[PDB]
Design a binder for this molecule. Structure first.
Ligand SMILES: *[C@@H]1O[C@H](CO)[C@@H](O[C@@H]2O[C@H](CO)[C@@H](O[C@@H]3O[C@H](CO)[C@@H](O)[C@H](O)[C@@H]3O)[C@H](O)[C@H]2NC(C)=O)[C@H](O)[C@H]1NC(C)=O
Ligand SMILES: Nc1ncnc2c1ncn2[C@@H]1O[C@H](COP(=O)(O)OP(=O)(O)CP(=O)(O)O)[C@@H](O)[C@H]1O
Ligand SMILES: [Mg+2]
Lengths: 362, 1126
């Protein structure tokens, strides 16, 4: 007949647990969430305070550094060593002008000499820090060619007029050749030639190696693949034309599949601080000692008053020294205990009790 | 082509299945949030606004448009089956070998007792020269047998073997949309003879579409011409839809969401204008400048970037969320087996699937009495004739139970003791039943001078003569045939005359077949008038023969009506005994109202044909005239009833529709102020208000009760009596509630009033109370502080003006449950529109918003299904503006860090699937399947309903606190991913770099999805398995999507975000704590509320963890008569 299906879903009677938030259940829950997060707030800062980091900003080598060794001023270097034994000693820095680069806005070689008192563990990450560089703007972050990233010999039409991500201001140059790493992102590539070693000075004179292999994710070689251009239809980007002065040969096209500094730079940073891996050493522990780092200065940052730096770290599983997660899990545990202390001391020593059914309509 | 005939169906549905799609699309874009996506998708195609995937930018629009289309197609599906069933469910054979279905020019054969879906033109029938009888039921209040005398000329056809030799249809002009006219005339050419003929076709020859044919056979005629020539398609069928308060106060919540949406776009515009006139920036050297413009036109473009950027703040799936939920809340109203009438086989039918939350916030219920609150099957007789009362009953003589003892069955045996002495002495000359539960009133009628013994026998014949009862051939035992009446009170008087001996066998063409006291006379009824609900009158003018042979036979006039109409139609001075009976017979009906018995009255004047043959012709000229459906018939039918001699009144019973345990025991101790709108009299409604418990003991019954009833036509200019008296005690009943008329403080005060104070206004006193200003506001303030308003709301304008006086002058929800054609003004005028399905499908059900089999189901429909669907939707809508707030502002807070240049944080498949898959389903299932308490506890504690009466759940205050909580959690779900990056931008365990903004977007999204859906989970009562599965599945689809989208190379920059972000412990570290700080201040505010200032429903749910409701069975129905005890 015309009778609805009594199947306990049309009857609105399903298997509910139906919680009622009485203080005999929620006050254990606030106690549980608090006592978990002060343990996680304890265990994070037990891991996070032990992280050692070296932050040396070198944007002022070409001005504020002599050819002899002077100390870095207090603003540029930041040292963190939780074994507080050599934390106040300044690193030193010279500048070899080389007189032949003829660019004169950012040239030379800033040689940075720092001293670490504690040995960083077996994974040492050398990052470059860029403050005030604006890698997160609308036209910037959409300026590349995914088909050029995937090694396809893309024509001018598929790099210029592509939907969404396309290399609009930098599709091709004056004489009609497209740019192979076209776009503002690949044009804006952080130049500075970091060394393939940290040359240990004085005490040992055995150089601590730094590889440029393994700098990006290993799975990122599935979208960065070797290009298929015939070397006559491509050109380097207009700010790459000093590292490729005669354009491209038949042999000097960069394989972006194994050129991982490109693969880190083609991942634009989200904020006004860019920190990208450039040199790793997975093999060796870096002992305590005085190291020299020879940065060929080529990437100019002073015209936008921005900082340009170095981040030497063995970051933890959380990555980097950032006290935010430890402070928050403590604040999360200290609020969930204080809100339990409020909702228990207002519950007993004054307040109300669940003793009546005469609280609704009396 | 020439004579312009296209083919068409019967009734349109305004969604034609060939032209459904383009008219649905333009209907979708009257929504401003919907057309806001047509802006940001056409601005998506232009490259200067920096949106990747512009072709995929259409996906959260096209998915919403198709789902609103397949909802509109499903809402067309149960709509078009009303028009499809009447269109072509049947087709006649139309055999033409001798040379319900639509065909222009057909010669169709129509039998008895069926609907005619056409305009048939009558030619002949089985009767004398085409005398057709018709019951025009669904057009007007036409309860007579409207005579349709056809042509006396073309009565030669019997079969379809001679009329099918001519194939022709006639030509007519355009429609006129009026009932009583037909300006068509058919002309035909004779065979082998030069005689032209114009058959005069008038309203007496034709009948309309939506009527019911009775008693005539082989109705032959011609189907109408195409177009809109049927005169019912414009008079009735085009009805204005309604939406809830919450669906009307939603449009202010959408504007606050768009005012915020254009503040954020404006801050994105002016703070990127401030960026492009900064002097030393990176957009000079590396980024080549001038994206669109130089200085401020670059910031003006960045305004419209933010319009496309904040495309998840615009509520696009709001209106499909409110309409899926309202549909599923009504499909559970439909699919409830406790709202199901087993005896009638009728589930509760929502005619409006979009006002379910209106059933949760109603304060005034305007039920009518006899059809709705009572069974409307009338059993007892209780005759009164000539100043003495004939009948004994104890069914409702227990109405005055305030002064009587406990059990009284000794008088109930005296009924049967006098009943078995009644079937013997009445079976001396009768061959009807006259048995147990056949005869109705136990009373010795004179043990059959002495004029009283005739006068009771003259009453029962004249009662049987003034009837609208057609006999019916009883199929089992055809020797005793039964009775049928459209008015069931009118059947009980006729079923009992059959028991006293004045039965009637049948009904001839002009007169009537009647079996009075054994002998079978034929009273000839030449004239009769109709019954209207406003007139309260059914009268016959049956002709009698003269007693002495060789005279002029006079006639009678038996008017049957109420005890207040014909007492205003009664002869004052007379030389007979027509005066001294009145203080007897009105004293009996006062005794026969206070025992709850429905009353009638019958008077009779001895007219002559010297005064009657003019009034007959005055009615007969006005029987085929223009005013046959106007009010000019009653003034024609008033002049001969100026003087009357009263026979007596009758006092039949009407037992209740077992809506005693709801009417206060659920449904007015809910908090709702109920309002009976009877149409019966004052004393019988008070003593039926106690019986249905509506007004109870210790309740002040302040009665308005105008004393004199007369019409004014001249004089009375310096003074006033008949209107000044009811104005002054509306002031004098304002010492009970010590206030005055002037102010509406009560409009902003919805509250169940302390102090009982029922109101018993009636009839003419109501007309004077709603005539002019300063008495309407004075009556209505007395009607806010009451709990029950009662009686004599006859002539449904009084029922419809009262439901509109409270609905408009107080911004309040009204319900007005009813049945029958006298409530199609009351039901349609109210906010909610419940109707009662009787034995047949009546006009109130089809014009209703819900339709239940009895009044008994209104308690579960209002207190369970409505009170849920209020609190479901009053929670859902602040959760929907919450879920867009947490997500679409956490890429506003990224605007600080890209200098508001509008580079996307969320990859655009997280802005696609946010309102569709990631968090759409928990808010849907909070709206569909949330119950604050069980369906049993909803009826055990019905004071839970007062949160809708108080409007304490949905208000714009709550909406602002859910935006501000969403704006807080937007700060948490962005700056907690931000401050794990802000120090040194290395968040991976292996130092490899997640610094891309899409990877920070996964940090921000996954916090904002799980803390959204747990915010929905923490705000639903009863975590059931089904919504609990799809809160878990909506949280684990935002991981499943990046598992399978960031594992294809097609996700360009987003290539392997599953393995890199979920392999990173800093994701899971901030995911487990920025879901804390999102949910913690609300779960603190909710836990501080539920401990120290709890609502009623936390008090009830704290009683529910205890065993305060374990006594009650599952599916408890305390208004069901056969239920166990608590
Ligand atoms: C990476 O290194 C190169 C040099 O090692 C940096 O210098 C860029 O060099 C190109 C060509 O040498 C400059 O283009 C020139 O600009 C002048 C106007 O200043 C114009 O007259 C010439 O015709 C030519 O186009 C380019 O301006 C210069 N870069 C800047 C920012 O000034 C380069 O900057 C380093 N960085 C990047 C991201 O490549
Ligand atoms: N068939 C009939 N013949 C004569 N009088 C009738 C009648 N049906 C009703 N009446 C009388 O007319 C008066 C008004 O009739 P109406 O059409 O209002 O019925 P009602 O008021 O009882 C239905 P409701 O209770 O839903 O308002 C009633 O008091 C009734 O006594
Ligand atoms: Mg009724």
């Amino acid at each position: 007949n015309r009778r609805p299906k009594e199947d306990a879903f049309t009857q609105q009677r399903l298997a509910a647990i139906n919680p009622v938030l009485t203080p005999r259940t929620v006050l254990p829950l606030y106690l549980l969430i608090a006592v978990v997060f002060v343990i996680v707030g304890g265990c994070i800062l037990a891991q996070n305070s032990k992280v050692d980091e070296v932050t040396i900003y070198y944007q002022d080598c070409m001005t504020n550094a002599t050819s002899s060794w002077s100390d870095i001023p207090s603003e540029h270097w930041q040292f963190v060593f939780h074994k507080y034994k050599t934390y106040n000693t300044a690193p030193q820095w010279r500048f070899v002008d080389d007189e032949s680069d003829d660019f004169t806005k950012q040239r030379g070689t800033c040689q940075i000499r720092f001293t670490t008192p504690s040995d960083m563990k077996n994974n040492v990450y050398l990052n470059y820090v860029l403050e005030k560089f604006a890698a997160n703007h609308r036209r910037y972050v959409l300026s590349f060619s995914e088909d050029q990233i995937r090694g396809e010999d893309a024509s001018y039409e598929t790099v210029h007029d592509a939907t969404g991500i396309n290399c609009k201001p930098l599709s091709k140059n004056a004489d009609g050749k497209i740019y192979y790493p076209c776009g503002l992102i690949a044009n804006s590539m952080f130049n500075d030639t970091f060394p393939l070693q940290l040359t240990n000075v004085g005490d040992t004179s055995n150089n601590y190696s730094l590889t440029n292999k393994g700098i990006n994710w290993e799975s990122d070689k599935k979208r960065y693949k070797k290009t298929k251009y015939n070397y006559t239809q491509i050109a380097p980007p207009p700010y790459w034309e000093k590292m490729y002065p005669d354009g491209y040969n038949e042999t000097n096209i960069p394989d972006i599949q194994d050129w991982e500094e490109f693969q880190n730079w083609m991942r634009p940073g989200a904020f006004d601080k860019i920190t990208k891996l450039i040199r790793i050493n997975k093999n060796d522990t870096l002992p305590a000692g005085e190291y020299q780092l020879d940065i060929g200065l080529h990437w100019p940052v002073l015209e936008f008053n921005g900082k340009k730096g170095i981040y030497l770290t063995h970051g933890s599983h959380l990555g980097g020294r950032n006290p935010f997660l430890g402070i928050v899990y403590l604040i999360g545990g200290c609020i969930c205990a204080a809100m339990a202390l409020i909702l228990l001391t207002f519950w007993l020593f004054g307040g109300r009790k669940i003793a009546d059914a005469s609280s609704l309509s009396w | 082509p020439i004579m312009q005939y296209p083919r068409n169906k019967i009734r349109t549905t305004k969604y034609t299945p060939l032209t459904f799609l383009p008219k649905n699309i333009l209907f979708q874009f009257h929504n401003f949030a919907n057309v806001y996506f047509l802006v940001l998708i056409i601005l998506g195609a232009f490259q200067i606004f920096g949106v990747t995937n512009p072709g995929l930018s259409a996906v959260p629009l096209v998915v919403i448009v198709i789902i609103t289309a397949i909802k509109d197609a499903i809402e067309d599906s149960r709509r078009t089956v009303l028009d499809l069933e009447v269109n072509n469910t049947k087709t006649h054979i139309l055999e033409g070998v001798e040379n319900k279905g639509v065909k222009v020019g057909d010669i169709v054969r129509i039998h008895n007792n069926d609907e005619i879906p056409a305009d048939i033109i009558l030619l002949s029938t089985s009767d004398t020269d085409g005398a057709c009888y018709v019951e025009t039921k669904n057009l007007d209040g036409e309860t007579n047998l409207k005579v349709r005398q056809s042509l006396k000329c073309t009565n030669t056809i019997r079969t379809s073997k001679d009329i099918a030799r001519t194939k022709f249809w006639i030509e007519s002009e355009g429609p006129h949309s009026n009932l009583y006219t037909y300006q068509g005339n058919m002309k035909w050419r004779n065979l082998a003879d030069g005689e032209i003929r114009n058959e005069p076709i008038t309203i007496n020859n034709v009948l309309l579409r939506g009527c019911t044919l009775r008693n005539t056979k082989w109705a032959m005629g011609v189907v109408m011409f195409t177009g809109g020539d049927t005169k019912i398609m414009l008079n009735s069928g085009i009805t204005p839809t309604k939406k809830s308060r919450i669906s009307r106060e939603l449009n202010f919540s959408v504007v606050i969401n768009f005012v915020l949406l254009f503040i954020l776009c404006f801050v994105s515009g002016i703070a990127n204008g401030v960026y492009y006139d900064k002097k030393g920036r990176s957009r000079f050297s590396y980024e080549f400048g001038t994206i669109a413009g130089s200085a401020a036109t670059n910031g003006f473009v960045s305004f419209w970037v933010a319009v496309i950027l904040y495309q998840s703040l615009v509520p696009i799936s709001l209106y499909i969320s409110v309409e899926i939920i309202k549909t599923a809340q009504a499909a559970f109203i439909y699919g409830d087996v406790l709202l199901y009438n087993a005896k009638l086989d009728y589930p509760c039918t929502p005619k409006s699937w979009n006002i379910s939350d209106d059933l949760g916030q109603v304060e005034y219920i305007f039920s009518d009495k006899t059809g709705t609150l009572t069974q409307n099957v009338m059993e007892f007789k209780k005759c009164t004739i000539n100043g003495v009362s004939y009948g004994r009953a104890y069914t409702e003589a227990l109405a005055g139970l305030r002064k009587r003892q406990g059990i009284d069955v000794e008088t109930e045996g005296r009924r049967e003791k006098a009943e078995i002495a009644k079937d013997r002495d009445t079976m001396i000359d009768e061959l009807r039943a006259l048995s147990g539960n056949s005869q109705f009133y136990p009373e010795e009628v004179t043990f059959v001078g002495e004029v009283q013994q005739r006068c009771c026998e003259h009453f029962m014949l004249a009662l049987a003569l003034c009837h609208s009862v057609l006999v019916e051939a009883n199929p089992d035992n055809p020797k005793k045939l039964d009775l049928k009446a459209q008015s069931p009170d009118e059947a009980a008087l006729v079923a009992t005359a059959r028991d006293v001996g004045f039965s009637f066998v049948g009904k001839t063409k002009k007169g009537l077949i009647i079996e009075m006291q054994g002998i079978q006379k034929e009273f000839e009824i030449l004239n009769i008038l109709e019954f209207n609900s406003s007139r309260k009158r059914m009268s016959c003018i049956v002709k009698i023969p003269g007693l002495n042979p060789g005279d002029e036979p006079r006639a009678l006039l038996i008017c049957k009506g109420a005890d207040s109409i014909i007492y205003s139609r009664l002869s004052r001075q007379s030389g007979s005994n027509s005066e001294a009976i009145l203080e007897k017979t009105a004293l009996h009906l006062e005794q026969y109202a206070t025992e709850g018995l429905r009353t009638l009255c019958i008077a009779q004047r001895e007219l002559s044909w010297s005064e009657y043959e003019k009034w007959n012709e005055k009615y007969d000229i006005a029987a085929a005239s223009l005013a046959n459906r106007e009010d000019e018939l009653e003034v024609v039918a008033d002049s001969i009833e100026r003087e009357l001699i009263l026979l007596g009144g009758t006092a039949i019973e009407d037992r209740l529709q077992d809506g005693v345990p709801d009417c206060i025991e659920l449904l007015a101790e809910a908090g709702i102020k109920l309002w009976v709108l009877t149409g019966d009299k004052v004393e019988t409604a008070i003593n039926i208000g106690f019986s249905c418990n509506l007004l109870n003991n210790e309740m002040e019954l302040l009665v308005i009760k105008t004393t004199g009833d007369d019409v004014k036509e001249f004089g009375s200019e310096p003074s006033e009596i008949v209107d000044a008296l009811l104005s002054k005690y509306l002031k004098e009943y304002f010492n009970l509630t010590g206030s005055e008329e002037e102010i509406f403080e009560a409009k902003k005060d919805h509250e169940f009033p302390k102090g009982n104070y029922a109101i018993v206004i009636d009839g003419d006193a109501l007309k004077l109370a709603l005539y002019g200003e300063d008495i309407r506001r004075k009556f209505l303030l007395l009607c806010k502080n009451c709990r029950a308003v009662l009686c004599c709301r006859v002539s449904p304008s009084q029922k419809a003006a009262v439901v509109k006086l409270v609905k408009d002058s107080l911004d309040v929800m009204t319900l007005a449950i009813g049945d029958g054609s006298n409530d199609v003004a009351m039901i349609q005028s109210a906010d909610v529109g419940i109707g009662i399905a009787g034995e047949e499908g009546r006009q109130a059900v089809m014009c209703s918003d819900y339709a239940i089999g009895q009044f008994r189901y209104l308690a579960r429909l209002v207190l369970v299904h409505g009170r849920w669907s209020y609190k479901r939707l009053a929670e859902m809508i602040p959760e929907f503006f919450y879920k867009n707030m947490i997500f679409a502002l956490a890429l506003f807070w990224y605007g600080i860090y890209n200098d508001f240049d509008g580079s996307y944080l969320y990859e655009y498949t997280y802005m696609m699937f946010y309102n569709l898959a990631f968090t759409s389903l928990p808010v849907i299932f909070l709206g569909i399947l949330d119950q604050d308490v069980n369906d049993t506890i909803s009826l055990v504690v019905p004071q839970l309903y007062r949160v809708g009466i108080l409007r304490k759940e949905w208000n714009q205050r709550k909406f602002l606190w859910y935006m501000l909580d969403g704006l807080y959690q937007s700060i948490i779900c962005f700056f907690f991913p931000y401050l794990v990056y802000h120090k040194n931008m290395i968040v991976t365990s292996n130092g490899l770099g997640l610094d891309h903004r899409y990877f920070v977007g996964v940090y921000v999204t996954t916090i904002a999805v799980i803390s959204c859906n747990t915010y929905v989970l923490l705000h639903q009562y009863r975590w059931d398995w089904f919504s609990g599965l799809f809160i878990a599945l909506s949280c684990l689809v935002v991981f499943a999507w990046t598992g399978i989208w960031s594992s294809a190379i097609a996700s360009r920059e987003f290539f392997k975000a599953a393995a890199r972000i979920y392999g990173a412990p800093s994701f899971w570290a901030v995911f487990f704590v920025a879901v804390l700080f999102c949910l913690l201040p609300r779960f603190t505010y909710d836990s501080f509320q539920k401990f120290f200032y709890p609502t009623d429903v936390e008090i009830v749910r704290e009683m529910w963890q205890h065993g305060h409701f374990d006594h009650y069975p599952p599916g408890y129905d305390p208004t069901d008569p056969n239920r166990p005890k608590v």
